[PDB]
Structure 1
């Protein structure tokens, strides 16, 4: 029900997965995905899946997000 992974750890795992895909290492990417699954909740894993697919369906335009940021 409660996860324990921080944003920095998630970003590091995602970068490791990207390098693994570029490095032709299936075992390492599988291990990273297993760690992500075992150290996250249902909602966290759903959001991770959405981010991986690169389709969040937030409903807020990119320009609105950028304007809010600056």
Structure 2
């Protein structure tokens, strides 16, 4: 019901997944995904799946996010 991951850790794990896919090593992808699964809650994992597939469906336009930012 509670996670123990920070944003930097998640970015590092995703970077490892991408790089190891580029290098044709699936064991490291499995290890990174296992760490993410073991150190995350169900909601966090749902959002991680959405981020991996690259579709969040927030309902707010990218232009709106940029306008809010600056």
Instruction: State the TM-score, normalized to the length of structure 2.
Output: 0.99
Shift of 1:37: 0.2
Shift of 1:22: 0.3
Gaps of 5+ in 2: none
Mapped to 2, the partners of 1:69 and 1:48 lie a distance apart of: 23
Deviation readout 1:19-64 (Å, 9 max, x if unpaired):
0100100000000000000000000000000000000000000000
Gaps of 5+ in 1: none
Instruction: State the TM-score, normalized to the length of structure 1.
Output: 0.99
Mapped to 1, the partners of 2:61 and 2:40 lie a distance apart of: 28
The list of structure 1 runs, each at least 4 consecutive aligned residues, that deviate by more than 2 angstroms after superposition, is none
